[PDB]
Amino acid sequence: ACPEKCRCEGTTVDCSNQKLNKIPEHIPQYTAELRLNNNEFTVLEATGIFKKLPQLRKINFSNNKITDIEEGAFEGASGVNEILLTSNRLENVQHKMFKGLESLKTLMLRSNRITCVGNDSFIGLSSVRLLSLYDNQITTVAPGAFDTLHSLSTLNLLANPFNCNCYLAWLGEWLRKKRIVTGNPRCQKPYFLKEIPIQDVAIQDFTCDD
Ligand SMILES: *[C@@H]1O[C@H](CO)[C@@H](O)[C@H](O)[C@H]1NC(C)=O
């Protein structure tokens, strides 16, 4: 039976535009797509309702105002292929956020507020083949931040204020060596390299200034 604020058409449970804080009460066991987008979520809490939703393959959190995800917001979600977090307020990532997503193939993180990627912001997501970081606020990327992601084929870096200082030298190399679609991200600082693709800059000009 359909949860109160939602709409249940086939195997999709739609809980769009409902001014919602918390995931609705009795999500039917059969469900395959849970839509939570366009609500007002602030923080995703540890839930374990995903433990008994073995059919769920997609979850939509687009267009909320999520600042944090607690470890185990996704406990037992071994089935899901894609979670959409596009348009939210995440300020960074930690693998802890995604404990439980054993099969995740798609992670949309587009249009959040992530200021940097960590040497293990994405540890353990060995199955994702598309990760979008488009339109965030990323300044650098620690070395090997991506080495973990063995399945990765499309990584959208575009629309971030990359600082091409000595700290981002390595990303240049990585980009030109890993045959992986990125869109061709461009340097935003320092002034003399603005709007030049990262991968293009000579090893000599990455020079964080003393
Ligand atoms: C990145 O390298 C390892 C691998 O995850 C990690 O333990 C370490 O904290 C990171 N390096 C530094 C210097 O923070």
Side-chain angles (χ1 to χ4, degrees), residues 1-4 6-21 23-24 26-51 53-178 181-202 204-208:
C2 209
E4 323 248 336
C6 304
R7 263 150 346 194
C8 304
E9 221 194 359
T11 51
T12 311
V13 166
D14 195 12
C15 322
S16 273
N17 312 71
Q18 226 81 213
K19 270 115 50 164
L20 283 177
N21 276 307
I23 310 184
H26 294 295
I27 324 278
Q29 228 212 296
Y30 66 64
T31 163
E33 176 169 355
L34 178 68
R35 281 214 197 101
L36 290 172
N37 60 88
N38 280 258
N39 282 287
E40 51 212 38
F41 282 89
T42 317
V43 53
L44 291 192
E45 283 184 334
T47 194
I49 58 178
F50 293 116
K51 280 199 270 150
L53 292 181
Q55 248 59 261
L56 191 61
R57 307 298 231 284
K58 190 205 259 273
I59 299 166
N60 196 358
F61 277 114
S62 296
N63 298 291
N64 280 267
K65 30 171 170 280
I66 291 156
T67 64
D68 203 26
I69 308 172
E70 282 191 337
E71 189 191 301
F74 296 116
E75 180 205 3
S78 51
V80 353
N81 289 135
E82 98 191 65
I83 89 157
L84 302 193
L85 285 160
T86 145
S87 286
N88 269 295
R89 292 170 181 169
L90 293 163
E91 213 142 355
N92 40 241
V93 199
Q94 287 121 266
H95 58 112
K96 257 80 203 278
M97 279 162 177
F98 312 112
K99 237 215 81 63
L101 306 163
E102 271 323 78
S103 292
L104 194 69
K105 260 104 188 167
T106 301
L107 180 45
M108 224 64 65
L109 277 167
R110 181 195 196 92
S111 294
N112 274 261
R113 291 168 185 174
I114 294 155
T115 55
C116 77
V117 174
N119 112 297
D120 52 18
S121 270
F122 301 117
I123 262 202
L125 302 187
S126 45
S127 258
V128 4
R129 55 171 112 273
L130 194 169
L131 167 39
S132 205
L133 292 178
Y134 182 78
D135 185 43
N136 273 262
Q137 207 73 60
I138 296 159
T139 271
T140 54
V141 184
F146 304 134
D147 291 5
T148 143
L149 316 192
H150 296 126
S151 271
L152 192 48
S153 56
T154 308
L155 169 63
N156 185 342
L157 285 189
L158 299 168
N160 286 264
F162 286 110
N163 192 333
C164 292
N165 54 351
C166 74
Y167 284 85
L168 202 80
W170 79 271
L171 182 55
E173 264 262 343
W174 189 78
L175 283 175
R176 80 191 87 98
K177 176 195 216 82
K178 282 264 203 76
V181 184
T182 358
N184 211 27
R186 289 154 202 291
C187 293
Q188 220 57 35
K189 250 103 54 237
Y191 62 130
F192 80 95
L193 291 178
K194 186 172 202 269
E195 226 65 74
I196 280 186
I198 304 197
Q199 108 177 39
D200 274 347
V201 171
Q204 287 184 141
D205 283 313
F206 289 101
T207 61
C208 60

